[PDB]
Amino acid sequence: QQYECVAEIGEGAYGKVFKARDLKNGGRFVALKRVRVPLSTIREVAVLRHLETFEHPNVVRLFDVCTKLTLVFEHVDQDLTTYLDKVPEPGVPTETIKDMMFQLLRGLDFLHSHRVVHRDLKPQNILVTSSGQIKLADFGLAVTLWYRAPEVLLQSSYATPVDLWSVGCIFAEMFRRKPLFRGSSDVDQLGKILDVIGLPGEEDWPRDVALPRQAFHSKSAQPIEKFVTDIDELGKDLLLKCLTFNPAKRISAYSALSHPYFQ
Ligand SMILES: CCN1CCN(Cc2ccc(Nc3ncc(F)c(-c4cc(F)c5nc(C)n(C(C)C)c5c4)n3)nc2)CC1
Numbered sequence: 001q002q003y004e005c006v007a008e009i010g011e012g013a014y015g016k017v018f019k020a021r022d023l024k025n026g027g028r029f030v031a032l033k034r035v036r037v038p039l040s041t042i043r044e045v046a047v048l049r050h051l052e053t054f055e056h057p058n059v060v061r062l063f064d065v066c067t068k069l070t071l072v073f074e075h076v077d078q079d080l081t082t083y084l085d086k087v088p089e090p091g092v093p094t095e096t097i098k099d100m101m102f103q104l105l106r107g108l109d110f111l112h113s114h115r116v117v118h119r120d121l122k123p124q125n126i127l128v129t130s131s132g133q134i135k136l137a138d139f140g141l142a143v144t145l146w147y148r149a150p151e152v153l154l155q156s157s158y159a160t161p162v163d164l165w166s167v168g169c170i171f172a173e174m175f176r177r178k179p180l181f182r183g184s185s186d187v188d189q190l191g192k193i194l195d196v197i198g199l200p201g202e203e204d205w206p207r208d209v210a211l212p213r214q215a216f217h218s219k220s221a222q223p224i225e226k227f228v229t230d231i232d233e234l235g236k237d238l239l240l241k242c243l244t245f246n247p248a249k250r251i252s253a254y255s256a257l258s259h260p261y262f263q
Contacts, residue, residue: 049065080126084174084177109253118163148186150193153189153193
Protein backbone atom coordinates (compact mmCIF):
# COMPACT_ATOMS: atom_id res chain seq x y z
CA GLN A 1 0.00 0.00 0.00
CA GLN A 2 0.87 3.77 -0.38
CA TYR A 3 0.28 4.41 3.40
CA GLU A 4 1.58 2.80 6.62
CA CYS A 5 -0.51 3.23 9.85
CA VAL A 6 1.78 3.73 12.86
CA ALA A 7 -0.70 4.95 15.57
CA GLU A 8 -4.41 5.58 16.28
CA ILE A 9 -5.57 9.23 16.66
CA GLY A 10 -9.30 8.59 17.22
CA GLU A 11 -12.26 6.17 17.05
CA GLY A 12 -16.05 6.66 17.08
CA ALA A 13 -19.36 6.75 15.15
CA TYR A 14 -17.48 7.72 11.92
CA GLY A 15 -14.80 5.01 12.00
CA LYS A 16 -11.13 5.43 12.90
CA VAL A 17 -8.46 8.13 12.36
CA PHE A 18 -4.83 6.90 12.09
CA LYS A 19 -1.44 8.68 12.04
CA ALA A 20 0.19 7.13 8.93
CA ARG A 21 3.47 7.33 7.05
CA ASP A 22 3.01 8.67 3.47
CA LEU A 23 5.55 6.38 1.75
CA LYS A 24 5.43 8.11 -1.66
CA ASN A 25 5.92 11.62 -0.29
CA GLY A 26 9.19 11.30 1.65
CA GLY A 27 7.69 9.41 4.60
CA ARG A 28 5.77 12.47 5.88
CA PHE A 29 3.05 11.87 8.50
CA VAL A 30 -0.55 12.06 7.23
CA ALA A 31 -3.91 11.47 8.98
CA LEU A 32 -6.10 8.70 7.37
CA LYS A 33 -9.80 8.67 8.19
CA ARG A 34 -11.70 5.46 7.32
CA VAL A 35 -15.53 5.60 6.65
CA ARG A 36 -18.49 3.12 5.99
CA VAL A 37 -20.84 2.24 2.99
CA PRO A 38 -24.21 6.23 -1.51
CA LEU A 39 -24.90 9.60 -3.45
CA SER A 40 -25.09 12.34 -0.70
CA THR A 41 -21.58 11.01 0.22
CA ILE A 42 -20.34 11.33 -3.45
CA ARG A 43 -21.47 14.98 -3.23
CA GLU A 44 -19.84 15.62 0.22
CA VAL A 45 -16.47 14.30 -1.11
CA ALA A 46 -16.84 16.61 -4.19
CA VAL A 47 -17.34 19.66 -1.88
CA LEU A 48 -14.25 18.55 0.15
CA ARG A 49 -12.08 18.31 -3.06
CA HIS A 50 -13.53 21.71 -4.20
CA LEU A 51 -12.69 23.41 -0.83
CA GLU A 52 -9.16 21.98 -1.08
CA THR A 53 -8.57 23.89 -4.42
CA PHE A 54 -8.55 27.12 -2.33
CA GLU A 55 -5.95 25.56 0.05
CA HIS A 56 -7.22 27.89 2.89
CA PRO A 57 -4.47 28.10 5.60
CA ASN A 58 -6.98 27.60 8.46
CA VAL A 59 -8.37 24.18 7.38
CA VAL A 60 -6.55 20.86 7.21
CA ARG A 61 -5.12 20.04 3.69
CA LEU A 62 -6.80 17.15 1.87
CA PHE A 63 -3.98 15.21 0.06
CA ASP A 64 -5.96 12.23 -1.32
CA VAL A 65 -9.30 10.33 -1.40
CA CYS A 66 -9.38 6.49 -1.80
CA THR A 67 -12.12 4.02 -2.91
CA LYS A 68 -14.48 1.69 2.24
CA LEU A 69 -13.69 5.48 1.97
CA THR A 70 -10.22 6.80 2.95
CA LEU A 71 -9.59 10.52 3.48
CA VAL A 72 -5.92 11.51 3.55
CA PHE A 73 -5.17 14.82 5.30
CA GLU A 74 -1.96 16.66 6.28
CA HIS A 75 -1.02 15.48 9.79
CA VAL A 76 -0.90 18.02 12.65
CA ASP A 77 0.73 17.10 16.01
CA GLN A 78 -1.87 18.39 18.48
CA ASP A 79 -5.45 19.56 19.09
CA LEU A 80 -6.56 22.67 21.12
CA THR A 81 -7.39 20.35 24.12
CA THR A 82 -3.74 19.11 24.51
CA TYR A 83 -2.51 22.70 23.78
CA LEU A 84 -4.66 24.15 26.64
CA ASP A 85 -3.62 21.24 28.97
CA LYS A 86 0.16 21.91 28.46
CA VAL A 87 0.15 25.78 28.50
CA PRO A 88 2.00 27.18 31.63
CA GLU A 89 0.38 29.32 34.37
CA PRO A 90 -1.29 31.91 34.44
CA GLY A 91 -2.56 30.58 31.06
CA VAL A 92 -2.62 31.31 27.30
CA PRO A 93 -0.99 34.72 26.51
CA THR A 94 -3.60 37.46 25.86
CA GLU A 95 -2.32 38.00 22.25
CA THR A 96 -2.10 34.21 21.62
CA ILE A 97 -5.86 34.00 22.45
CA LYS A 98 -6.57 36.91 19.99
CA ASP A 99 -4.46 35.40 17.16
CA MET A 100 -5.88 31.83 17.53
CA MET A 101 -9.43 33.25 17.64
CA PHE A 102 -8.84 35.30 14.46
CA GLN A 103 -7.52 32.18 12.65
CA LEU A 104 -10.44 30.08 14.02
CA LEU A 105 -12.84 32.74 12.59
CA ARG A 106 -10.98 32.87 9.21
CA GLY A 107 -11.27 29.10 8.71
CA LEU A 108 -14.92 29.27 9.81
CA ASP A 109 -15.74 32.20 7.46
CA PHE A 110 -14.03 30.30 4.59
CA LEU A 111 -16.26 27.24 5.28
CA HIS A 112 -19.46 29.36 5.75
CA SER A 113 -18.90 31.41 2.56
CA HIS A 114 -18.61 28.07 0.67
CA ARG A 115 -21.91 26.94 2.34
CA VAL A 116 -20.28 24.29 4.60
CA VAL A 117 -21.58 24.15 8.19
CA HIS A 118 -19.13 22.45 10.60
CA ARG A 119 -21.87 21.40 13.23
CA ASP A 120 -19.38 19.77 15.65
CA LEU A 121 -16.91 22.57 16.44
CA LYS A 122 -14.96 21.76 19.65
CA PRO A 123 -11.27 21.94 20.84
CA GLN A 124 -10.88 18.23 19.87
CA ASN A 125 -11.16 19.05 16.12
CA ILE A 126 -9.38 22.45 16.25
CA LEU A 127 -5.75 21.54 15.47
CA VAL A 128 -2.66 23.55 16.56
CA THR A 129 0.34 23.38 14.22
CA SER A 130 4.10 23.32 15.23
CA SER A 131 4.24 27.07 14.32
CA GLY A 132 1.02 27.88 16.28
CA GLN A 133 -1.38 27.92 13.26
CA ILE A 134 -5.10 26.93 13.75
CA LYS A 135 -6.41 24.27 11.34
CA LEU A 136 -10.00 23.03 11.27
CA ALA A 137 -10.64 19.29 10.86
CA ASP A 138 -13.68 16.88 10.86
CA PHE A 139 -16.18 18.77 8.61
CA GLY A 140 -18.07 18.26 5.32
CA LEU A 141 -19.08 14.67 6.22
CA ALA A 142 -22.44 13.65 7.82
CA VAL A 143 -20.74 12.52 22.42
CA THR A 144 -20.17 16.00 24.00
CA LEU A 145 -22.99 18.60 23.92
CA TRP A 146 -20.85 21.32 25.62
CA TYR A 147 -20.44 23.34 22.38
CA ARG A 148 -23.96 22.73 20.97
CA ALA A 149 -26.02 25.83 20.11
CA PRO A 150 -29.47 26.28 21.87
CA GLU A 151 -31.35 25.85 18.50
CA VAL A 152 -29.64 22.41 17.96
CA LEU A 153 -30.51 21.37 21.59
CA LEU A 154 -34.15 22.57 21.13
CA GLN A 155 -34.08 20.87 17.64
CA SER A 156 -35.37 23.93 15.70
CA SER A 157 -32.75 25.36 13.25
CA TYR A 158 -29.34 24.19 12.00
CA ALA A 159 -27.94 27.09 9.91
CA THR A 160 -24.35 28.57 9.99
CA PRO A 161 -24.88 30.49 13.41
CA VAL A 162 -24.66 27.05 15.11
CA ASP A 163 -20.81 27.23 14.66
CA LEU A 164 -20.61 30.80 16.03
CA TRP A 165 -22.17 29.62 19.35
CA SER A 166 -19.45 26.87 19.48
CA VAL A 167 -16.78 29.60 18.77
CA GLY A 168 -18.06 31.60 21.78
CA CYS A 169 -17.72 28.49 24.00
CA ILE A 170 -14.16 27.96 22.66
CA PHE A 171 -13.20 31.69 23.12
CA ALA A 172 -14.29 31.50 26.82
CA GLU A 173 -12.41 28.19 27.29
CA MET A 174 -9.17 29.71 25.86
CA PHE A 175 -9.19 32.06 28.94
CA ARG A 176 -10.69 29.57 31.52
CA ARG A 177 -8.82 26.43 30.33
CA LYS A 178 -12.04 24.56 31.27
CA PRO A 179 -15.34 24.26 29.28
CA LEU A 180 -17.91 27.04 29.88
CA PHE A 181 -21.12 24.90 29.79
CA ARG A 182 -20.54 21.35 31.03
CA GLY A 183 -24.02 19.75 30.75
CA SER A 184 -24.80 15.99 30.95
CA SER A 185 -27.83 15.96 28.54
CA ASP A 186 -29.53 18.27 26.00
CA VAL A 187 -31.97 19.55 28.73
CA ASP A 188 -29.14 19.96 31.25
CA GLN A 189 -26.90 21.73 28.63
CA LEU A 190 -29.71 24.21 27.86
CA GLY A 191 -30.26 24.81 31.61
CA LYS A 192 -26.51 25.50 32.16
CA ILE A 193 -26.53 27.95 29.18
CA LEU A 194 -29.57 29.98 30.44
CA ASP A 195 -28.12 30.10 34.05
CA VAL A 196 -25.44 32.37 32.47
CA ILE A 197 -27.06 34.26 29.48
CA GLY A 198 -30.47 34.41 31.18
CA LEU A 199 -33.92 33.62 29.78
CA PRO A 200 -34.55 35.17 26.31
CA GLY A 201 -37.78 37.01 25.40
CA GLU A 202 -40.79 34.77 24.61
CA GLU A 203 -40.50 35.92 20.88
CA ASP A 204 -36.80 34.78 20.76
CA TRP A 205 -37.93 31.23 21.76
CA PRO A 206 -38.61 28.93 18.72
CA ARG A 207 -42.23 27.92 18.00
CA ASP A 208 -43.29 24.25 17.54
CA VAL A 209 -40.35 22.80 19.58
CA ALA A 210 -40.97 20.23 22.35
CA LEU A 211 -39.25 22.37 25.09
CA PRO A 212 -41.12 25.58 26.05
CA ARG A 213 -39.57 28.72 27.63
CA GLN A 214 -41.57 27.83 30.85
CA ALA A 215 -39.52 24.60 31.30
CA PHE A 216 -36.66 26.92 32.49
CA HIS A 217 -36.57 29.36 35.47
CA SER A 218 -32.91 30.50 35.00
CA LYS A 219 -34.08 34.06 35.99
CA SER A 220 -31.32 36.71 35.30
CA ALA A 221 -28.29 36.92 32.98
CA GLN A 222 -25.13 36.79 35.15
CA PRO A 223 -22.11 39.08 34.28
CA ILE A 224 -19.79 37.12 31.95
CA GLU A 225 -16.54 38.47 33.63
CA LYS A 226 -17.51 36.22 36.63
CA PHE A 227 -17.13 32.97 34.54
CA VAL A 228 -14.47 34.36 32.18
CA THR A 229 -11.89 36.17 34.35
CA ASP A 230 -9.23 38.41 32.66
CA ILE A 231 -11.34 39.02 29.46
CA ASP A 232 -11.03 42.64 28.14
CA GLU A 233 -14.07 44.91 27.32
CA LEU A 234 -13.80 44.21 23.55
CA GLY A 235 -13.38 40.44 24.00
CA LYS A 236 -16.49 40.53 26.27
CA ASP A 237 -18.56 42.33 23.53
CA LEU A 238 -17.49 39.71 20.90
CA LEU A 239 -18.09 36.84 23.38
CA LEU A 240 -21.69 38.04 24.03
CA LYS A 241 -22.41 38.47 20.29
CA CYS A 242 -21.32 34.79 19.71
CA LEU A 243 -23.33 33.62 22.76
CA THR A 244 -26.64 35.25 21.64
CA PHE A 245 -29.65 32.87 22.07
CA ASN A 246 -31.46 33.93 18.85
CA PRO A 247 -29.38 32.59 15.88
CA ALA A 248 -30.75 35.38 13.60
CA LYS A 249 -29.27 38.01 16.01
CA ARG A 250 -25.96 36.10 16.50
CA ILE A 251 -22.81 37.66 14.89
CA SER A 252 -21.51 35.90 11.75
CA ALA A 253 -17.85 34.78 11.30
CA TYR A 254 -17.46 37.56 8.67
CA SER A 255 -18.56 40.44 11.02
CA ALA A 256 -16.56 38.85 13.87
CA LEU A 257 -13.44 39.24 11.62
CA SER A 258 -14.15 43.07 11.57
CA HIS A 259 -14.87 43.39 15.36
CA PRO A 260 -12.75 46.04 17.27
CA TYR A 261 -11.28 43.15 19.39
CA PHE A 262 -9.02 42.31 16.36
CA GLN A 263 -7.84 45.96 15.72
C1 LIG B 1 -7.33 9.62 22.67
C2 LIG B 1 -6.61 10.93 22.76
N1 LIG B 1 -5.24 10.90 22.20
C3 LIG B 1 -4.41 12.03 22.66
C4 LIG B 1 -4.89 13.33 22.07
N2 LIG B 1 -4.85 13.28 20.60
C5 LIG B 1 -5.27 14.57 20.03
C6 LIG B 1 -5.00 14.72 18.55
C7 LIG B 1 -5.99 15.09 17.66
C8 LIG B 1 -5.74 15.19 16.31
C9 LIG B 1 -4.44 14.92 15.86
N3 LIG B 1 -4.06 14.91 14.51
C10 LIG B 1 -4.77 15.14 13.36
N4 LIG B 1 -4.03 15.68 12.38
C11 LIG B 1 -4.68 15.91 11.22
C12 LIG B 1 -6.03 15.62 11.03
F1 LIG B 1 -6.62 15.99 9.86
C13 LIG B 1 -6.72 15.01 12.14
C14 LIG B 1 -8.14 14.57 12.13
C15 LIG B 1 -8.85 14.42 10.93
C16 LIG B 1 -10.18 14.07 10.94
F2 LIG B 1 -10.85 14.00 9.77
C17 LIG B 1 -10.88 13.80 12.12
N5 LIG B 1 -12.18 13.40 12.39
C18 LIG B 1 -12.23 13.30 13.70
C19 LIG B 1 -13.45 12.91 14.45
N6 LIG B 1 -11.04 13.61 14.33
C20 LIG B 1 -10.70 13.28 15.74
C21 LIG B 1 -9.68 12.16 15.82
C22 LIG B 1 -10.27 14.52 16.50
C23 LIG B 1 -10.15 13.94 13.29
C24 LIG B 1 -8.81 14.32 13.33
N7 LIG B 1 -6.07 14.79 13.30
N8 LIG B 1 -3.45 14.57 16.70
C25 LIG B 1 -3.74 14.47 18.01
C26 LIG B 1 -5.71 12.18 20.14
C27 LIG B 1 -5.24 10.86 20.73
